[PDB]
Design a protein that fits this description.
The structure is cut from a larger assembly and holds chains A (409 residues), B (649 residues), C (484 residues) and D (426 residues). Helix content of chain C is 36%, strand content 20%. Chain C has 484 residues and is α+β, with helices and mostly antiparallel strands. In chain C, helix 5 crosses helix 6, helix 5 crosses helix 12 and helix 12 packs across helix 13. A six-stranded mixed β-sheet of chain D has the order 8-10-9-12-7-11. In chain D, helix 2 crosses helix 6 and helix 12 packs across helix 13. The two termini of chain D are 64 Å apart. Classes of the chains: A mainly alpha (409), B alpha+beta (649), C alpha+beta (484), D alpha+beta (426). Strand 17 of chain B pairs parallel with strand 2 of chain C. The structure holds zinc ion. The site of zinc ion has 9 residues of chain A, from helix 11. The PDB classes it as transcription.
């Protein structure tokens, strides 16, 4: 990364970076033939012979003499797995480099294989009363065999429904967001109060707000520093696309220093794709607790009850909090751009927005918002075209606006 | 559930009634459910192997499933006596036999291979039946033939054991890549049979593709191999075009209809609806006439031979016998019109059944017995592969090298168990080779077997006590040259970690294999392998310019099924996210230009072909018009006929 | 040799598969299963079924010149002839019809149209399944449904009883079972039919007053209408199912009633008809017609398959009595234990023929201005010899041979599909629970061989399972709950 | 902008040549030239040489009595509830019969038929008008007197219409899609009006219900031809208009490859031969010098079995091209950033039987694929301007993270190479 900075983000440095990456891969290939990486359990057996600690660790079962709770067995299996990894790394073995590098070894599966398996949930999501005292290497119980088969069938069913999901939301989110454009202009000249305020609770929001500017004590828009800590617990105003005063598009001030990077590509399209990918992946993995915030994010984007009950600053702060809960990390600029598309106001002109008081700032459902869009070309390409063409509810006869897909028709 | 509390290990102890599929896979006691499911699916997906062998580590149930399954052989239901034999063609014949006790007659037949479905099939080892002659008594347990899956003594074989080692090769075994030597790939030979039919009407005529003027054969004969991946072709005759197109009959014209396949002709079946006089005056139908005469002669002979049986009411026959005889009697009689697919045809229709062997194609799949799937990435000369060159086993070579990225993530330590068992067996084989006297070598052999499996050791000791001295020596020779089999129960009686621990403790002579030039002393062992069906050839659609639909747009066709196209050639369609991502670049005009040039606009695609054909091959400078696309015009028709209209801006 | 030893050691094994289970498909005979498909036509008295038989294939061709035609699409079929009888105006007609069925080949295969199809086992329920609030019985004609509802009634002093009634909702109408028995045998025949006659008494309001308080301390009273009132023993009313009977009886406590109406069967015939159709004239006729239809509900096959005592299944009335006498226990039943389930292979094949014959018999149900002779002649005309195979290949009861290798006993011979015709499987969440595995599967069904295409749609039986004989292929001959 | 809705007047639109007359679609085992299956105006199904295009529009006269348009009818039902009853003429006993004998008069507005309703349309609208709810609809009616009644009815191309004349086993069955079915009824129905030349009241007593069924069938037509032709993903508006079929395309299964930089990829010989068929045909025409037909013969022989000379020709082609003969690789289904790649051909595989597409390992993560059996699609690119425009889709562009502006992790070293470099360093 730092190289790309001293050399001006040129194309030639990108080419040479690709070349060096490829060559390094080839060199790793030849060194990897000419150095062996084989695996067998004889290494484990010999280690156990050498170290009695590992020997008795692999030779262990749950003390079933007392009643064991779910949390207790989870704690004990966690401590045992950590002990296994620690002793494996400490001593020389034919898999030392494997676990030090971390490629091709998963802690959980390792602990399950050597240490005890641990309890498994029912198809409906209930822990069984009788956890698997044995371990995969040691053997299994017929009841344990049944439990494992049930878990596998649960995984298969979940995979079936997950594939059946078909990735439907990206369809409409992209279909709406794709028309967004960028305009090379120094500053939208928006009002100071048009800058939306955000409060800081942790460093995560600072990560969300890189390559941007905040008004200082003097009010000058100075670059935000994520490493900086003086911004903890402060409400400060930031420029945003949802409040930009450019009617042609988005000025370079709102996009911050990031603007220069993105001038080649449709900013909104990157925003929508870079949002829809990790979120869908996280939701699908969670379905394979943490899933509930993801559904909350989906509702916030879709159902729009919270938007009908609150204001733009509140909704964007909630969106940032939800993004933090979900675990994915994306630049807040793209989120503010989705909100800019989300926007809806009475006067299509943004010049009024540059004044002291902003006009009505209402936001609707994603499908409603797209169907709201006065350009009919994108509306027809959507669903629900029946009422659009045969009924006058959506005044599609009235609506008219230019767009990119309008050329496609 | 309480039912979960209900089930007790004591109820099922010392019995395998619960487990159904993993009866064929050793050591299910250590594997995960997902892997077991994968293995069950693979065993549903296994394919025939030309060099099939029985696995070294067996679970006593392969023989059972083989014996009970009845799609791979034909056991005579009772002792019979053959009365006569007839042959249809060179490679197939039929046997008329009579029951010894019941006094009822029955048919048998032979063929080089059996057609299972589409591509899939298998070649038939008809040695036993062909060894039979006339007037010889057959026995109840005698099997007339069998597939290659069955060994000499009905031993089940659905895979083959290969030397394998865990090793990463040039960052090329990343993901599930598998590299194999040439000899092993030559082993994994699999048959394939295709059935294809061609219709010849009064209009279309054949061509003398094969042979000189005197030997007019549009399709290869039985012994011949199909050449140039083409069986036959037909020219669409026209009365007007009889002066230019029909000329040069020996050479094919550009606008004709060929057929495409590979292999060797196994059998031919012709149905003709035309009088034979025309065939007599047809020179370009001499081959079909000859085949028809051969078939008719066969039917005449069979009818003559079986008439005495069929007209005898006292005789008892199978319904199969009567059905076959009625079929031939249908064939011989005149005025017998054939109506394929509930419709009469003109000319004739002839069907070829063809068999061919394939070796391993780069990109096929091989899996063990625990779902360790993979794809054959690249194949090498065996000299360019890790080998051990030390000690007694100097010069040993490993055919395949699996991916050592991680087995712990795939949750199946059983593969390692099998590998180390077979490696230890190799070492024991060396030790018993070093032995001089028969008594002490059989002693050490049964000693090891007892260390691993005591009851099967008792069975071996009973057998060796049963065997005579010279036969016993021949047996040890077989052990030293093949190996030693190991019995391994699926769930009850298999090995665990502790027995391996004890083995390595006592077997201090065991040592890592020191491969040459390789830094680590890797380990080589036998593992069972089975080849799947999913081949790269199954998805290979590629189209340049094929038939368009009524909307003047690309559309798939039925030529591929009728074997008129070498490759599948079915076009790809661009969908939602395709247009979306293409519009990630700020070149909407460019995307529209591409869509118009490829398929949408007829004029634009035509001008693309015009410009592209001529001009500099290295540099293509396309020029595009602005004619309205067909899609826009048909949408205009949609709107105007709806009562809607069109009005830009 | 190594092969010699391997063969011997495989022979010495003690664990063997079930041989008769493997060749089970050869055991089934179509004639026996076809017989009830003919018998269900006996709803209309006009048809007189004589019997069906498989025609021999013993015919042998002789040279002839009938410009005959032969086709490549090879199908191996045997002919079956059914003989029915009709008699009108002292003249009789024996109608004889013929159909084609595929024959067993290789001891398990069908050859149709030069293609190889294989039948497989199908999994279904034994009977009396539990869903929603309603108890049900699965029968080929029409599943019997009984649905319960809460009711609160106040006694003479106001004693309120929260208390649950089971109405019968059949023939697209909610018609209680007690009124069926109650039209059949009268109130007193109804009460004595369950043996509960003596415990129950009934009197008018003044006669209710003359009833001593000792009777009240022995029998709880259930006021019928502003005048009339019934009484049931308190010890009898202790049983919950007895509460249920009294509850449906309370549902019979219609507001409008007169003593002579309580004392006439024709009155309840009219009530039943009015439930079916409010037309006063049709009340008697439709009541009787639905009485005989409700008798038609029972079929000999269902009586055979059901594990209940024959006295409880002598007639359909006895069947309903058995259901509602034990209603609460039958509500509590496993929906997944295989002892509740069963396997069928030769039944669904004739199901399209059953539907066609039911359609014909339904046309005979709605006969009007049609002579019975001509009606039967028209009905026994639509059936075609090739109709059976045509329906089979249409509805995909058989599956196209998708094999790839010779192994067949473990993916052809023992392949069962839980779904299929006459099956409730779909994408529902409870059907998702259907995809879930159940502990009773252990040792009778392959628990880890589901198709990855759709989980739980199909699997493989274990070869060590032995099904009890003379149980119509029941995994357990006894029901899930014996009702001890 | 785009294609704008307007129920423009058909009379100035309509043309005399496209007005169809009443005739059965078939005639003496041949399509009638006057019915809907006319070849005079309307195209030829089997032959594509018809100079006139598929977008010809057929046309039906109803000038005698003007009819409300179906498209606005639903809107009409909004402005005036149950206008279907007003146009429904039950006030008749000569042929309709007494029937119910009890009906909702509703001020005698109902059961007046279409003609009377048209005559008093303004009065009925004044009777049923909500200034608070239906005011906008009534205003849009105000801007539209000219379009409410339609005098011409159009019909789709028979070539566009999938309706066919099959030969069913029972007999020749005209298997039409349902569209013309109602259309046939429509024209058959209009036949009666042009049949009803004689004037008499009882005829009008029957003629008005005929107009009722006219409007009913018109609404049937609009709803039906919008049910499937332009609805859902089966519909035409999404199946083709946005994305369609491609004639120069292929698809293959990917396998790893080494010894080359990340960008270079290799293709199997057969698929490369098929994709660039016309480039090779051009070069072979130039070098052989004979006409293009024998060149096509040679190329056929070349794809049939392995040839050294043809391989040399493609090697020259890859060497000497301006852009290196690049293409697009996309992974079904593309749901991630840069899920499409712009790659450049580097080497033609020599082994004939090989059919897999080599790809460098480092591109596995960016396109989200695996060697397990995924099927990926390739679209060749030809125009030089297209090459320049799609250069932004080259993996070198995706090397920079559009998210954070750092080096992209998807192009970072994968598992095995990470391990190996770790051995070298540590
Ligand atoms: Zn701005």
């Amino acid at each position: 990364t730092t190289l790309l900075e001293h050399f001006g983000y040129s194309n030639e440095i990108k080419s040479i970076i690709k070349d060096v990456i490829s060559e390094l891969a080839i060199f790793s290939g030849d060194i990897n033939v000419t150095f062996g990486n084989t695996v067998s359990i004889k290494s484990l057996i010999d280690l156990g012979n050498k170290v009695k600690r590992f020997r008795e660790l692999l030779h262990y079962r749950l003390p079933n003499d007392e009643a064991l709770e779910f949390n207790d067995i989870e704690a004990i299996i966690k401590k045992n797995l950590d002990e296994i990894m620690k002793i494996l790394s400490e001593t020389d073995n034919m898999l030392r480099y494997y676990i030090d590098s971390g490629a091709g070894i998963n802690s959980k599966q390792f602990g399950q294989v050597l240490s005890l398996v641990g309890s498994k949930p029912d198809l409906f999501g209930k822990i069984i009363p009788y956890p698997i005292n044995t371990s995969f290497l040691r053997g299994l119980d017929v009841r344990s065999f049944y439990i494992n088969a049930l878990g596998a069938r649960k995984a298969l069913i979940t995979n079936y429904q997950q594939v059946r999901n078909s990735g439907y939301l990206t369809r409409k989110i992209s279909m709406l967001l794709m028309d967004t454009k960028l305009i090379d202009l120094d500053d939208c000249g928006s009002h100071e109060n048009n800058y939306l305020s955000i409060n800081v609770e942790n460093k995560d929001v600072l990560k969300r707000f890189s390559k941007r500017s905040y008004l200082n004590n003097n009010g000058e828009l100075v670059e935000i520093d994520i490493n900086d800590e003086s911004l903890i617990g402060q409400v400060i105003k930031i420029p945003s696309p949802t409040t930009c005063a450019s009617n042609e598009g988005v000025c370079r001030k709102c996009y911050g220093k990031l603007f220069d990077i993105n001038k080649d590509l449709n900013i909104g399209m990157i925003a929508v794709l870079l949002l829809t990918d990790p979120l869908t992946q996280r939701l699908l993995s969670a379905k394979h607790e943490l899933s509930k915030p993801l559904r909350e994010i989906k509702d916030l984007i879709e159902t729009n009850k919270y938007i009908k009950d609150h204001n733009v600053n509140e909704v964007v702060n909630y969106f940032i909090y939800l993004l933090n809960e979900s675990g994915i990390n994306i630049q807040s600029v793209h989120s503010e751009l989705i909100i800019r598309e989300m926007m809806k106001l009475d006067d299509s002109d943004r010049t009024q927005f540059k004044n002291d008081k902003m006009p009505d700032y209402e936001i609707f459902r994603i499908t409603d918002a797209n169907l709201k869009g006065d350009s009919l070309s994108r509306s027809l390409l959507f669903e629900q075209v029946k009422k659009q063409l045969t009924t006058l509810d959506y005044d599609t006869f009235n609506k008219t606006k230019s767009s990119i897909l309008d050329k496609l028709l | 559930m309480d039912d979960i509390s209900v089930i007790k290990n004591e109820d099922y102890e010392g019995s395998h009634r619960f487990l159904a599929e993993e009866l064929l896979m050793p050591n299910a006691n250590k594997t995960d459910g997902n892997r077991s499911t994968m293995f069950c699916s693979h065993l549903a997906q296994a394919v025939t192997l030309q060099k099939a062998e029985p696995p070294l580590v067996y679970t006593n149930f392969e023989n059972q499933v083989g014996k009970y399954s009845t799609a791979g052989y034909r056991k005579a239901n009772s002792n019979y006596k053959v009365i006569e034999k007839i042959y249809k063609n060179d490679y197939n014949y039929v046997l008329i036999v009579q029951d010894q006790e019941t006094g009822e007659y029955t048919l048998f037949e032979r063929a080089e291979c059996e057609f299972l479905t589409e591509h899939y099939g298998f070649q038939w080892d008809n040695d036993k039946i062909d060894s039979l002659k006339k007037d010889d008594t057959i026995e109840k347990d005698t099997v007339l033939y069998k597939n290659t899956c069955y060994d000499e003594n009905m031993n089940f074989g659905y895979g083959v054991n290969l030397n394998a080692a865990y090793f990463s090769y040039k960052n090329e075994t990343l993901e599930d890549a598998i590299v194999i030597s040439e000899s092993a790939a030559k082993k994994l030979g699999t048959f394939s049979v295709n059935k294809v039919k061609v219709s010849v009407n009064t209009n279309d005529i054949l061509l003398n593709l094969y042979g000189d003027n005197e030997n007019y054969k549009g399709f290869p004969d039985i012994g011949e191999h199909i050449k140039n991946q083409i069986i036959a072709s037909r020219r669409r005759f026209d009365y007007n075009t009889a002066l230019y197109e029909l000329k040069n009959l020996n050479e094919m014209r550009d606008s004709d209809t060929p057929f495409f396949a590979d292999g060797k002709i196994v059998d031919i079946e012709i149905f003709s609806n035309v009088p034979e006089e025309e065939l007599k005056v047809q020179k370009y139908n001499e081959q079909v006439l000859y085949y028809i005469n051969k078939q008719k002669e066969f039917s005449n002979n069979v009818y003559q031979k079986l008439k005495k049986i069929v007209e005898g009411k006292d005789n008892n026959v199978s319904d199969k016998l009567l059905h076959f005889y009625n079929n031939c009697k249908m064939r011989i009689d005149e005025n017998i019109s054939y109506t394929y697919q509930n419709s009469k045809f003109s000319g004739f229709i002839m069907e070829f059944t063809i068999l061919e062997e394939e070796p391993l194609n780069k990109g096929s799949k091989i899996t063990g017995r625990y779902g360790n799937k993979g794809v054959i990435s690249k194949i090498l000369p065996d000299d360019q592969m890790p080998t051990v060159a030390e000690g007694r086993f100097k010069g040993l070579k490993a055919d395949i090298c699996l991916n050592p990225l991680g087995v712990f993530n795939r949750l199946n330590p059983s593969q390692l168990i099998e590998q180390e068992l077979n490696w230890i067996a190799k070492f024991i084989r060396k030790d018993m080779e070093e032995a001089g006297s028969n008594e002490e070598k059989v002693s050490i052999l049964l000693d090891f077997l007892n260390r691993v499996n005591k009851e099967e050791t008792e069975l071996m000791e009973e057998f060796i006590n049963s065997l005579n001295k010279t036969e016993l020596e021949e047996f040890l020779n077989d052990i030293i040259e093949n190996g030693i089999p190991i019995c391994q129960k699926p769930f009850f009686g298999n090995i665990g970690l502790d027995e391996l621990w004890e083995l390595y403790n006592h077997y201090d002579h065991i040592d890592y294999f020191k491969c040459e030039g390789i830094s680590t002393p890797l380990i080589i062992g036998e593992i069972y392998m089975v080849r799947l069906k999913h081949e790269p050839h199954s998805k290979f659609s590629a189209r340049s310019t094929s038939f368009m639909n009524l909307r003047g747009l690309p559309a798939k066709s039925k030529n591929f099924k009728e074997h008129k196209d070498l490759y599948s050639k079915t076009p790809v369609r661009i969908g939602n996210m395709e247009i979306s991502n293409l519009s990630l670049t700020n070149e909407m005009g460019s995307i529209m230009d591409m869509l118009n040039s490829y398929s949408n606009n007829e004029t634009n695609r035509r001008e693309l072909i015009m410009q592209l054909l001529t001009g500099n091959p290295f540099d293509t400078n396309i020029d595009l018009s602005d004619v309205e696309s067909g899609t826009s015009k048909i949408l205009k028709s949609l709107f105007t006929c709806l009562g809607l209209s069109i009005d830009d801006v | 040799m190594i092969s010699n030893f391997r063969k011997f050691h495989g022979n010495k094994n003690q664990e063997k598969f079930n041989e008769n289970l493997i060749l089970n498909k050869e055991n089934e005979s179509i004639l026996n299963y076809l017989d009830p498909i003919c018998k269900t036509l006996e709803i209309i008295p006009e048809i007189t079924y004589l019997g069906s038989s498989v025609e021999p294939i013993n015919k042998v061709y002789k040279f002839n010149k009938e410009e005959k035609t032969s086709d490549i699409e090879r199908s191996e079929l045997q002919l079956i002839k059914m003989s029915f009888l009709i008699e009108k105006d002292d003249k009789k007609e024996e109608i004889n019809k013929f159909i084609y069925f595929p024959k067993l080949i290789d001891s398990q295969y069908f050859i149709i149209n030069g293609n190889r199809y294989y039948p497989i086992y199908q999994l279904l329920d034994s009977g009396t399944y539990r869903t929603n609030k309603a108890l049900t019985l699965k029968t080929l004609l029409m599943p019997i449904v009984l649905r319960e509802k809460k009711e609160t009634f106040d006694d003479i002093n106001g004693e309120t009883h929260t208390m649950l009634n089971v109405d019968l909702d059949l023939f697209k109408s909610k018609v209680p079972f007690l009124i069926y028995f109650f039209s059949k045998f009268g109130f007193e025949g109804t009460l004595e039919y369950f043996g509960l006659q003596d415990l129950i008494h009934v009197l008018m309001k003044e006669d209710l007053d003359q009833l001593d308080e000792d009777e009240i301390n022995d029998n709880v009273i259930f006021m019928i209408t502003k005048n009339i009132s019934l009484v049931v023993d308190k010890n009898f009313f202790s049983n919950k199912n007895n509460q249920i009977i009294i509850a449906t009886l309370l549902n019979c406590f219609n507001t409008r009633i007169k003593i002579d109406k309580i004392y006439e069967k024709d009155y309840w015939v009219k009530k039943l008809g009015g439930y079916f159709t409010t037309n006063n004239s049709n009340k008697q006729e439709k009541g009787e017609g639905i009485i005989l239809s409700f008798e038609r509900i029972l079929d000999e096959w269902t009586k055979k398959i059901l594990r209940t005592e024959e006295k409880n299944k002598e007639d359909i009335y006895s069947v309903v009595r058995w259901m509602i006498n034990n209603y609460l226990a039958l509500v509590k039943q496993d929906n997944m234990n295989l002892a509740n389930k069963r396997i069928r292979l030769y039944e669904y094949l004739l199901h399209p023929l059953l539907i066609k014959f039911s359609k014909g018999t339904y046309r005979v149900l709605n006969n009007r201005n049609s002579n019975k002779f001509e009606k039967i002649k028209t009905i026994f005309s639509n059936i075609q010899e090739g109709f059976l195979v045509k329906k089979i290949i249409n509805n995909e009861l058989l599956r196209y041979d998708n094999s790839v290798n010779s192994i067949s006993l473990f993916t052809l011979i023992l392949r069962y599909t839980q779904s299929g015709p006459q099956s409730p499987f779909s994408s529902n969440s409870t059907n998702n629970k259907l995809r879930g595995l159940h502990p009773s599967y252990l040792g009778r069904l392959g628990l880890t061989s589901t198709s990855a295409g759709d989980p739980g749609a199909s699997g493989s039986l274990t070869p060590f399972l032995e099904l009890p004989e003379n149980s119509y292929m029941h995994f357990t001959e006894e029901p899930e709950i014996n009702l001890n | 902008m785009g294609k704008k809705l307007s129920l423009i007047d058909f009379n100035e639109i309509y043309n005399e040549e496209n007005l169809i007359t009443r005739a059965n679609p078939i005639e003496n085992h041949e399509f009638s030239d006057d019915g809907i299956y006319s070849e005079r105006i309307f195209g030829s199904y089997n032959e594509d040489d018809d100079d006139k295009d598929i977008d010809t529009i057929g046309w039906i006269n109803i000038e005698p009595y003007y009819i409300i348009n179906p498209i606005l009818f639903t809107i009409i039902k909004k402005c005036i509830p149950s206008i279907n009853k007003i146009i429904n003429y039950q006030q008749s006993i000569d042929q309709n019969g007494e029937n119910i004998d009890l009906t909702e008069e509703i001020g005698e507005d109902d059961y007046i038929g279409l003609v009377k309703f048209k005559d008093n349309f303004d009065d009925l609208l004044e009777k049923y008008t909500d200034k608070k709810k239906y005011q906008k609809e009534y205003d849009f009616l105000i801007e539209n007197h000219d379009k409410i009644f339609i005098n011409k009815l159009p019909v789709f191309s028979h070539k566009l219409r999938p309706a066919t004349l099959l030969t069913g086993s029972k007999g020749k069955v005209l298997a039409f899609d349902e569209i013309n079915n109602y259309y046939n009824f429509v024209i058959e129905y209009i036949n009666q009006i042009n049949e009803g030349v004689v004037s008499d009241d009882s005829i009008d007593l029957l003629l008005l219900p005929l107009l009722y069924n006219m409007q009913f069938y018109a609404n049937n037509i609009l709803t039906r031809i919008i049910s499937e032709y332009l609805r859902g993903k089966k519909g035409f508006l999404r199946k083709n208009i946005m994305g369609s079929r491609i004639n120069f395309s292929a698809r293959n299964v990917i396998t790893p490859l080494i010894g080359h930089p990340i960008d270079e990829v290799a293709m199997p010989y057969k698929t490369f031969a098929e994709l660039y068929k016309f480039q090779l045909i051009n070069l072979i025409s130039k070098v052989k010098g004979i006409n293009y037909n024998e060149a096509l013969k040679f190329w056929e022989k070349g794809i049939l079995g392995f040839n050294q000379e043809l391989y040399n020709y493609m090697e020259e082609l890859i060497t000497k091209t301006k852009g290196g003969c690049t293409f697009l690789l996309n992974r079904n289904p593309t749901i991630s950033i840069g899920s499409i790649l712009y790659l450049k051909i580097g080497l033609i595989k020599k082994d004939y039987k090989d059919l897999t597409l080599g790809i460098s390992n480092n591109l596995l993560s960016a396109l989200s694929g695996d060697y397990d059996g995924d099927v990926l699609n390739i679209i060749p690119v030809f125009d030089n301007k297209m090459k320049e425009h799609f250069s932004l889709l080259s993996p070198q562009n995706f090397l920079v993270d559009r998210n954070n502006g750092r080096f992209n992790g998807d192009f970072d070293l994968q598992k095995d190479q990470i391990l190996g470099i770790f051995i070298l360093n540590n």
